[PDB]
């Protein structure tokens, strides 16, 4: 299935995927309809459990190989940490990829028979300006001080030295929005530092990447929001926009995370989501089996 849309007969490709579900419905007053549910091609990655070894490779190589085995194009930015071993234990390809991507501070974008893994694009130029009182139909925005931290530390045990090893996170560089910094909000609760611990042999560079990912996770979720406007053909994710007309504390450059297009009865409007959620991927889904295999 391929879907395109536009104004005045000049259409642009929006969606490409497969039909998965096929349903019928007749309601109380006699109306009857047929409903179709289409998903992208990346759904091929979420239908089984596999086991694999990798020796003396990087995360980017394992991810590229797992993607290529499904006849999809891969575009994976390289990592610098080389691992003596990586193990995929009785889990789905999608879950393994997302876990390893998040632990390196990267995001996954899937579309048009292509999968891209890379760091968030917060260094560009704005695409449009959305002003309250000029362009907007609906608006929501929010801050929450409890998700901000001052510092992050990670600790592990080194048996070659018989001692503990520790790494600290660095302050990330992000886009400018509002006149309150994450460090100022971090002093409401005033926790000295967040601390992560692991009893196995985790080396220096891996602990460093882990702590850096945690700080970036926390800073990218400072302000979250949603905007509704009229039909916008050139909408794209992973870009910057400029938000204005909402006061000193919310004006500035915002990062786009998602898009919805709705065409109902001839009307067309779009919704733009800004910001990322603060929770880790593994905290929201159940990606481990049950004891005794459930028998």
């Amino acid at each position: 299935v391929e879907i395109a849309a536009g104004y005045d007969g000049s259409d642009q490709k929006i969606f490409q995927g497969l039909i998965v579900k096929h349903a019928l419905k007749v309601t109380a007053n006699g109306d009857s309809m047929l409903m179709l549910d289409c998903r992208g091609l990346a759904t091929k990655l979420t239908v089984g459990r596999h086991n694999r070894y990798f020796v003396d490779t990087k995360d980017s190589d394992a991810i590229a190989e797992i993607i290529a085995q499904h006849s999809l194009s891969a575009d994976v930015a390289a990592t610098q940490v080389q691992h003596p071993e990586i193990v995929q234990y009785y889990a789905t390809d999608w879950d393994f990829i997302l876990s390893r991507a998040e632990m390196n501070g990267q995001i996954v974008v899937a579309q048009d028979e292509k999968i891209k893994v890379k760091a968030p694009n917060t260094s560009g130029a704005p695409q449009i300006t959305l002003t309250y009182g000029v362009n907007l139909l609906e608006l929501e925005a929010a801050m929450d001080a409890r998700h901000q931290y001052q510092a992050v530390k990670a600790t592990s045990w080194n048996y070659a030295d018989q001692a503990l090893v520790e790494a600290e996170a660095s302050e990330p560089t992000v886009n400018n929005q509002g006149n309150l910094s994450g460090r100022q909000l971090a002093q409401v609760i005033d926790l000295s530092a967040l601390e992560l611990r692991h009893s196995g042999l985790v080396a220096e560079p891996e602990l460093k990447a882990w702590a850096d990912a945690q700080l970036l996770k926390s800073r990218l979720a400072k302000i979250q929001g949603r905007v509704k406007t009229k039909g916008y053909p050139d909408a794209k994710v992973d870009v910057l926009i400029q938000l204005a007309g909402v006061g000193d504390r919310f004006n500035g450059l915002a990062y786009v995370s998602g898009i919805r297009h709705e065409i109902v009865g001839g009307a067309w409007d779009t919704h733009i989501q800004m910001g990322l959620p603060p929770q880790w991927f593994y905290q929201e889904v159940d990606i481990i089996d049950k004891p005794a295999a459930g028998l």
């Binding site: 600790t155 045990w157 048996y159 070659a160 030295d161 018989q162 503990l164 611990r197 692991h198 009893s199």
Partner: protein, 147 residues
């Protein structure tokens, strides 16, 4: 109480003076607190009974592996000691794998050799007892030259 997953690493602090006569050892866990002295843990061994068993005890500073009963942090159990590059093994591993035995702190040895079929007991002073199939007999050697 909030529980614990998997196995952990422990470090020995004290061998004697168990408040109760239960033959436990004081161990601390470096990822919980490396400054406190820890808690008393039980030892699982090769053989144990009423005045029976193999009696080997670690020394202060040795690294051990810990399990927990019912995943309770308050019930640790010692499952054996570990070597490392900072605490080398008494022998180097080979592909043929001919030599086995017990080695102690003072370098006294009780060893077996499966290549030549030899059993030997040695003391660092030079006193030696050898049962050998290559020599087809028994030899007792003293550090003074008595043979």
């Amino acid at each position: 109480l909030p529980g614990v997953n998997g196995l952990q690493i422990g470090v020995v602090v004290q061998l004697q003076d168990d408040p109760n006569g239960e033959d436990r050892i004081l161990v601390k866990v470096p990822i919980i607190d490396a400054q406190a002295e820890g808690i008393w843990a039980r030892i699982a061994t090769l053989d144990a009974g009423n005045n029976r068993g193999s009696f080997f005890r670690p020394e202060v500073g040795d690294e051990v592996i810990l399990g927990f009963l019912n995943d309770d942090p308050r019930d640790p159990v010692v499952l054996g000691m570990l070597n490392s590059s900072a605490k080398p093994a008494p022998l180097r591993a080979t592909a043929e794998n001919h030599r086995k035995g017990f080695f102690t702190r003072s370098q006294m040895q009780l060893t077996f050799d499966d290549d030549k079929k030899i059993i030997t007991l040695q003391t660092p002073g030079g006193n030696k007892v050898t049962i050998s199939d290559e020599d087809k007999g028994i030899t007792l050697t003293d550090q003074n030259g008595n043979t």
